[PDB]
Structure 1
Amino acid sequence: GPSFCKADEKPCEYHADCCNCCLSGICAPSTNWILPGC
């Protein structure tokens, strides 16, 4: 449903531990444009 799987705003290193994208050491949504996600 409208929810994540692991957690958001939590700092991590591998994007895998998050359905969205763990960018700059954080589990967040697709906050990017030219930079690739995961």
Structure 2
Amino acid sequence: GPSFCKADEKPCEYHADCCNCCLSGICAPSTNWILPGCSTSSFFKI
């Protein structure tokens, strides 16, 4: 099961479509520094 997902530049509706992040503006990689936007956390376990 290889990692499947969309690429940068092409944004998405939610945030996991891209291999990193995809806001309405555009899709972006996960290698960032002071740019906030993706804050996903599990409320519980599996």
Instruction: Normalising by structure 2, report the TM-score.
Output: 0.41
Aligned length: 38
Indicate the percent of aligned positions where both proteins have the same amino acid: 100
Structure number with higher strand proportion? 1
Higher relative contact order (CA 8 A, sep 6+): 1
The higher radius of gyration belongs to 2
Instruction: Normalising by structure 1, report the TM-score.
Output: 0.43
Q: Give unmatched runs, 5+ long, in structure 1.
A: none
Q: Which runs of 4+ in 1 moved over 4 A?
A: 1-4, 30-35
Q: Give unmatched runs, 5+ long, in structure 2.
A: 39-46
